[PDB]
Write a protein that binds this ligand. Structure first.
Ligand SMILES: [Mg+2]
Ligand SMILES: [Mg+2]
Ligand SMILES: [Mg+2]
Lengths: 80, 127, 154, 98, 205, 96
RNA sequence: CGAAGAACCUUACCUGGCCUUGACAUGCUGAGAACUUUCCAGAGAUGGAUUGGUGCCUUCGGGAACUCAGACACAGGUGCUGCAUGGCUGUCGUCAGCUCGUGUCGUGAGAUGUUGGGUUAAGUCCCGUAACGAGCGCAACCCUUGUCCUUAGUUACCAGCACCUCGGGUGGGCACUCUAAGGAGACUGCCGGUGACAAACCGGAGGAAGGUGGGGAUGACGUCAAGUCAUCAUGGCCCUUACGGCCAGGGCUACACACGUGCUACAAUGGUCGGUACAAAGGGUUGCCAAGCCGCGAGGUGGAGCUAAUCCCAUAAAACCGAUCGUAGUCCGGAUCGCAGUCUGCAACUCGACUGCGUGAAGUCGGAAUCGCUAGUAAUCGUGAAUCAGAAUGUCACGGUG
């Protein structure tokens, strides 16, 4: 998926909101509806409030999550 | 000299050229054994020759197009029948009794598309 | 049910020169695999030739006569009573029954080298100890038990 | 709907509007000799444009009826309007045959 | 049930209403123009009843032959409307447009013309049967060897979907050698929509 | 000279219109040559609801036709091209 | 099954953000040509800058085309009613029946025709008969497949002559094959028996085809108030500061369970390896995308030829020849899962298709029951296409063995 000819992917608004927010370190969560963007080594340890579908759920970014996308950590269906 | 005949069976058109000789038998510029590999085709093409016992008298040159192994073999049989008739027009009764000059009109029935085969339907569960 | 059914004739066995063997080969064939079935039929024939000095065609003919039955039951219900009628087998039908039973019991022999299954079935059929002959004799014994309904309530 | 026919017309208009800058950006990407630096900035141009410019967003509907499902591109009609327009001989060369 | 009587016979009996060839890149572009040309023309010429609108394409321009039983209404004072429509059809059909008008002498032998008159009559709150008994007879006095007319709809009822079935003469439908006209024009009453079918049968062969 | 059309009642009837009008002007033009005809079968479904056993398959033809001149010395056929083409005849010139 | 293609778009549903003459039609008032602005905020919608252009016919007054703002009538609704309907389809059923003009009988609803003998795929026909005729229906007419004649030979063919590098490869020829338009051909036509000798039935000659040669299209009056108001059209009711619209995500592909259809298997009539043979049909100048070339492979480069007997898609597979496997939950089976990639797409986590390595499950022919098929039929093996940026075990179309 997403062959190495066009390797990386990150949405422009998320990139500009995170790269700039790295300068003023983490004091707030990042609310973003995009789930298609991967996380990067430049975004290790941040707090992302990924959209579940009706509310935003927090995400604790770790160094071992770089390969996977944000949407894997947000549910779609409950099945309680 | 030489006689011409055309064969058609199961979408396989064949040209048959009867010539005097010693039965060299050439099909698409290769031998009969190299063409039909260990099947009934070798005799089924040769059957009209032995029916009228003239296998050794005629050299046969053949060109084939269309169809598969058995269809092309039936085409060569039909072509040899029609060519042999054109040469010695007195043995029509002998080949008619054998049913070789009768062209086989059985063509692949068109698929009743929606039925899985030309006639096979779904399983029809009634409830 | 108006009688419509005509006769379609298939007679071609050049490499051995017979007529019954082509019809038997048609019973061995599965999914139109005539080329595969032909070498298995001949594969089980050369083994019979190896086993017995006599020509395998005579062995096959003797096997057909030892499996082909004479009479068989016919379950026709009178409309209130389940009766069975032993009816004389037609001369044309009796060969097909033997050719169908032979392959059917050959498939379940359970040996290796599938042609060997049919070769063994044909060898046993010439003596009378084969499973096909036992099935023939079982139906024959059933026919005598059913002989009471030969013509009455039949 | 009619408002749905309306909103997919502007999709086609936007797709046909640019029609060349996206082709150039995708041609830059596809070249193996192109530099990754010239590819990364090209990613920005595709993404900052509105997404309703690709052929993927375009849904070719029936021209007279607007039914999305049951469409043939050799005609411009739906599955059921094509029969009505064809049985009356409007479509040239179209008959009932076997 | 009762497949369309024109589609079964295109060739030996009938022919298409538009003869023109286009490649795969212009077939759908010409069909869309030709289909909405008829909708505009029929909506404009509600009066001066139109039966057939043939569209032919000679080399690269156009050709149209509108059929009207009253050509004088369309051709008013030496084509005041002919040129006016020729100017406007170019806007909907960019290629230049030719317009030709012919007569439909014996106008009571065309399915479209009969259906339009029936639809007009049934919208005047005319009896649903007296109109048809006279419409069939007037068309049978001259010309056709057989006519069927079906009138299905509300027919003035509360919850009723009855279908009138008056026939006269011989009207085969499984005979492809025959030449049969057909039309379907609807009528919008103050309540209900009434559909009218016509099967004017002309001579065979 | 090679022609393309879709019906034998225009292309094969316009061959005489060219042959007579070209042989009248002195230049010798041999008889026309037919070529094999294209045959494209378009198969589509006919049932509105899914009853797929119903079928309808069409056919479109494209008749080809080739001429052959002997001595090119007449421009009359070049001038009389609009006359030769009537409704659907496309002519590609190969003046042999 | 509507679905001939659910990542967004389709899309109606849900959670939010944002609109109120509105995304769209007409009529009124004012302002600017249209256009292009390559920038910033914001999830986007949207809001604000925005180099620049000042058009076009001019009674030189202005008009027309487009865009912005105001308000009215309004527009819009995949909101209800398919028992209010049109149109279209399923259905008994491609079953052979269903009706009408006149006359007659019966007080009447009716019935006669349409019943009786024979025969037929058939209410198809013959003989009788208060019935005489006609219509719908059946057959034929239409399409496809199988024989022959005439017209004419390029991109098709090579009988005769040269040539050759021995490939019709080349000149050349118009004999033929081959191609495809126009027509003949099959009507129990003829012979023997059978029948009331009359339909018709059983055999025979000829003929390519013999008894409606095969298949397809073509389904009568009607039934189920069968399905569709969501394809479209429409009577009535309702929403019209939202049941109408625009933008983001998510959802329709959830999951102890039961059901229908379909593909794989469980193997030795078989599994792999290496040779070798023959198809039909179709799609391609907004496209097919060759050769060489680099990659274990999906593929990347490359750009030919091409608008089609020319070039490509495009290698058909089963079969046949030689080796091994020796029936073992296995050189069967491929599900599952881990790692690594290519292609399409702004975007492959929910949620795509394939390729490389490893893992190796259930499955040893399957209860009551139950289905399709009478001949190129069932069985089995391929090829290409419609929808389509991508996506098929379903489905579109034709062929091998049989
Ligand atoms: Mg019966
Ligand atoms: Mg009756
Ligand atoms: Mg696709």
């Amino acid at each position: 998926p997403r062959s190495l000819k066009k390797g990386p992917f990150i949405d422009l608004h998320l990139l500009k909101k995170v790269e700039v927010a790295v300068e003023k370190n983490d004091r707030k969560p990042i609310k973003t509806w995009s789930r298609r963007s991967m996380i990067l080594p430049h975004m290790v340890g941040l707090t992302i409030a990924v959209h579940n579908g009706r509310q935003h759920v927090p995400v604790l970014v770790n160094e071992d999550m770089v390969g996977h996308k944000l949407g894997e950590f947000a549910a779609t269906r409950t099945y309680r | 000299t030489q006689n011409y005949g055309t064969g058609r069976r199961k979408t396989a058109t064949a040209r048959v050229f009867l010539r005097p000789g010693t039965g060299k038998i050439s099909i698409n510029n290769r031998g009969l054994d190299q063409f039909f590999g260990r099947e009934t085709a070798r005799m089924v093409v040769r059957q009209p020759l032995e029916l009228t016992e003239t296998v050794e008298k005629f050299d046969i040159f053949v060109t084939v197009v269309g169809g598969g192994v058995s269809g092309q073999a039936g085409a060569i049989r039909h072509g040899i029948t029609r060519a042999l008739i054109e040469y010695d027009e007195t043995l029509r009764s002998s080949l008619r009794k054998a049913g070789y000059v009768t062209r086989d009109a059985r063509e692949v029935e068109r698929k009743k598309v929606g039925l899985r085969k030309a006639r096979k339907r779904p399983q029809y569960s009634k409830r | 049910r108006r009688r419509v059914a005509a006769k379609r004739e298939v007679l071609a066995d050049p490499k051995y020169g017979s007529q019954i063997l082509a019809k038997f080969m048609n019973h061995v064939m599965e999914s139109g695999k005539k080329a595969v079935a032909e070498r298995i039929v001949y594969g089980a024939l050369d083994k019979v030739k190896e086993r017995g000095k006599a020509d395998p065609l005579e062995t096959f003919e003797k096997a057909l006569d030892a499996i082909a039955p004479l009479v068989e039951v016919k379950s026709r219900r009178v409309g209130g009573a389940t009766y069975q009628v032993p009816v004389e087998v037609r001369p044309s039908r009796r060969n097909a029954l033997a050719m169908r039973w032979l392959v059917d019991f050959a498939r379940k022999r359970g040996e290796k080298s599938m042609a060997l299954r049919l070769a063994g079935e044909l060898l046993d059929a010439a003596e009378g100890k084969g499973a096909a002959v036992k099935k023939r004799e079982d139906v024959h014994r059933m026919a005598e038990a059913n002989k009471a309904f030969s013509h009455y309530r039949f | 709907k009619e408002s749905m026919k309306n909103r997919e017309l502007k999709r086609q208009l936007t797709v046909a509007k640019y029609a060349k800058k996206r082709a150039e950006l995708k041609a830059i990407i596809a070249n193996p000799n192109s530099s990754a630096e010239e590819r990364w900035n090209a990613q920005v141009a595709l993404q900052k444009q509105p997404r309703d410019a690709s052929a993927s967003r375009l849904r070719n509907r029936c021209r007279l009826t607007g039914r999305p499902h049951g469409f043939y591109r050799k005609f411009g009609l739906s599955r059921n309007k094509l029969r009505e327009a064809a049985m009356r001989g409007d479509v040239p060369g179209l008959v009932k045959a076997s | 049930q009762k497949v369309h009587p024109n589609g079964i016979r295109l060739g030996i009996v009938k022919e298409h209403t538009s003869v023109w060839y286009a490649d795969r890149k212009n077939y759908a572009d010409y069909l869309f123009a030709d289909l909405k040309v008829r909708e505009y023309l029929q909506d404009k010429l509600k009066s001066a009843s139109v039966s057939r609108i043939d569209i032919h394409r000679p080399a690269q321009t156009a050709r149209i032959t509108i059929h009207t039983a009253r050509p004088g209404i369309v051709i008013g004072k030496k084509g005041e409307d002919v040129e006016k429509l020729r100017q406007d059809l170019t806007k909907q059909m960019g290629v230049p447009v030719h317009i030709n008008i012919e007569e439909i002498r014996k106008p009571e032998l065309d399915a479209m013309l009969v259906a339009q008159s029936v639809a007009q009559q049934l919208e005047r709150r005319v009896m649903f049967r007296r109109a048809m008994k006279r419409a069939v007879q007037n068309a049978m006095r001259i010309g056709a060897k057989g006519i069927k007319i079906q009138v299905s709809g509300r027919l003035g009822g509360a919850e009723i979907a009855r279908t009138e079935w008056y026939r006269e003469g011989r009207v085969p439908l499984h005979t492809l050698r025959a030449d049969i006209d057909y039309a379907t024009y609807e009528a919008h009453t103050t309540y209900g929509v009434i559909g009218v079918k016509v099967w004017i049968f002309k001579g065979e062969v | 000279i090679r022609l393309k059309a879709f019906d034998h009642r225009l292309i094969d009837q316009s061959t005489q219109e060219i042959v007579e009008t070209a042989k009248r002007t002195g230049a010798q033009v041999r008889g026309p040559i037919p070529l094999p005809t294209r045959k494209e079968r378009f198969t589509v479904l006919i049932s509105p609801h899914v009853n797929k056993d119903a079928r309808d398959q069409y056919e479109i033809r494209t008749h080809k036709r080739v001429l052959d001149i002997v001595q090119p010395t007449d421009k009359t056929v070049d001038a009389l091209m609009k006359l030769d083409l009537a409704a659907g005849v496309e002519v590609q010139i190969s003046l042999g």
